[model samples]
Target: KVFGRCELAAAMKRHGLDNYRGYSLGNWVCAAKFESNFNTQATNRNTDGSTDYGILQINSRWWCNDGRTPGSRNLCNIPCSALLSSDITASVNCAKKIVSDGNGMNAWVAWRNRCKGTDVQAWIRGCRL
Candidate 1:
């Protein structure tokens, strides 16, 4: 359960989701149970808001940091890029790293997966953004 639903929420925010508009996947994961149960092959349509590329639903294009290929090299070293690849466990852990190191979420990854990009804050907070 490293890079599951909760972790997915955190990753999207860190990658500039800004809200349900840009990162609608976060919106769904926060409200769904099946989201966390997804496997590496649990890919969804790559249309509209379906970024189901990695555990965090990372778009394949963003995986440039992982060598931009779907092989063991990138999958082994940096696997989030392999979510939609052949191996399953490898990609899952990669998703974990993004959520753990990137968003500072560990045990409370799911509970802490808040929408930092949304403008639901009070006027003061919203205006500050």
Candidate 2:
């Protein structure tokens, strides 16, 4: 598990978030929304007993969460899985790292690229936004 919305928005700024704009952080959030619905504790399945964990579904066991190396304490506790309460913000922040570190354009580009093939807004039953 990783960060919740409160932690994610804050960490994005420290990680070089520009002013909020339509093509800005919202795009990253949208990506994450589609991926995991802002739930830090969310996990999905994979082969070989491995799994994608936390927000943005980091392959914590095989992949680094972000630019920073995983700390001994966190990694040792879970051994390639992030405990959701420990840090949820890291999810979107790490996604930002992978998507929009520099010009803040990669995320937008990637968003448009992938999102182009998606529905703008789909019909849904009872659910919270």
Candidate 3:
């Protein structure tokens, strides 16, 4: 598993997420919190028969190759399984691509369902980065 909120923030910042486009660091942290609780190994089976992968819960339907889904548009050109790792480089980079597509955090269901329109300040409340 990857580090939790604070550490994840530091890593995200180091990965240049702190000023990626216009998305806030708080929203990024909150999305990760509700998506996988900072677990890089987390996976979820979507009702559409595709699975979400890694800390951001990126979908096999859109982001990565799950091997079972034919014609899957792997915009990140990464295997879905690669996201499920303690080292978050691939996952974070993939997520950056996902967000850059203009969807912002709306790419994750967890973000829309939980973090949307919410005060997510606490997602980065502590940890003196």
Candidate 4:
């Protein structure tokens, strides 16, 4: 996991995420924090019998491949293991596609629950953009 918001924010900026969907960099940071606490290795099993992967907690049932998870759609064509790395290039690309496919960040349950329609600028306070 990253030590603080600055590092995470800088990483997003490096990936050219500041205006990907006209969504603020702050929004992305908050979604990541709420979703996986900025830990690239984070994974969670859902009550619906699917798993979430990596920093954005991308769903295994429809987004990435987790061999044990049946009915995986793999819309991102990315291995679940790929999203687990500290390098977020693939994760960023997948997340961008996800946001573009639907209601922006609302595609992320964490963003909908925690950041959607909320002030998220605090997530990037003091970050070197």
Candidate 5:
């Protein structure tokens, strides 16, 4: 499912993304916008031959095991397909693990390039959250 900006914001917050590792909800919203545009089914194959899955674009190399990505760690211990679910619970959980693992928001290149060091509140400006 493709989520509205505010809807995604609230959902992430519910899953404990707000200020997780000092990154604000706005930062997450902004990153998701650039990463997958709030689309649950988004996937990208990396040059390293690993794939990124779901809204937060969790990497298959170190996060999820897709059975196709060589040297997958499956640190999240779930199949990559779980990240594609519209429920987003698995995606959010894996994202939290990524941040809590000390990768921080910098784990996402889109966040580093776009949301980092910026006034990301605009990403949720009109949202009631």
Candidate 6:
């Protein structure tokens, strides 16, 4: 499913992403915009043989186990396919684990490059959350 900006914001908040790890809902919304454009089935393959999956594009190398990535740690202990589901619960949970692991939101290059230190409020400006 492709979520609208406010829709994604509300969903993320409902799933406990708001103000998680000192980052606001806007930050998460902004990262999602840049990462997968709010598309639940989004996937990107890296040159290193790992793949990024789902809306937040969680990586398979160290996060989700795709059974294809060599030496995957599966720190999130979930199948990469789970991240592709439109439900987004697994993605949010994995993302929370990623940030909680001292990585912060910097684990995502899209967040670092596009959402970091920028005025991300616009990402959630009209949202009632």
The whole-model lDDT of each prediction reads 0.39, 0.46, 0.85, 0.87, 0.93, 0.94
Predicted candidate 2 versus true structure: per-residue lDDT over 74-111, tens digit per residue: 33234334434445544445544444445443333334
Off by over 4 Å in 3: none
Model 5 residue 76 lDDT score: 97
Model 6 per-residue lDDT tens digits across residues 1-129: 999999999999999999998999999999999999999999999999999999999999999999899979999999999999989899999999999988799999999999999999889987787
Native-to-model Cα distance after best TM-score fit, residue 13 in candidate 6, in Å: 0.5
Residue 98 of model 4, lDDT score: 87
Candidate rank order under TM-score: 6, 5, 4, 3, 2, 1
Candidate 4 C-alpha lDDT tens digits along 67-86: 87878899999998899898
lDDT of 1 by residue, 96-121 (tens): 44444444322223324553344323
Write down the RMSD of candidate 1 (Cα, Å): 11.8
Evaluation by lDDT, superior candidate among 2 and 5: 5
Q: Give the TM-score of candidate 1.
A: 0.31
What lDDT score is found at residue 98 in candidate 3? Answer: 91
Name the top TM-score candidate: 6
**How do all models score by TM-score?**
0.31, 0.46, 0.92, 0.94, 0.97, 0.97
Steric clash pairs (candidate 3): none
Worst 10 residues of 2 by lDDT: 120-129
After superposition, which runs of candidate 1 have C-alpha atoms over 4 Å from their true positions? 1-33, 45-50, 54-56, 64-81, 85-87, 105-129
Give model 5's TM-score versus the native structure. 0.97
- Per-residue alpha-carbon lDDT of model 5 for 52-88, expressed as tens digits? 9999999999999999998889999999999999998
**lDDT value, residue 85 of candidate 4:** 90
lDDT of 1: 0.39
Lowest-sum lDDT 10-residue window in model 6:
120-129
Best by lDDT: 6
Kindly report which residue stretches of model 5 are placed more than 4 angstroms away from their true locations once superposed.
none
Give the better candidate number (1 or 5) by TM-score. Answer: 5
Count of backbone collisions in candidate 1: 0
TM-score preference between candidates 5 and 6, better one: 6
Estimate the TM-score for candidate 6: 0.97
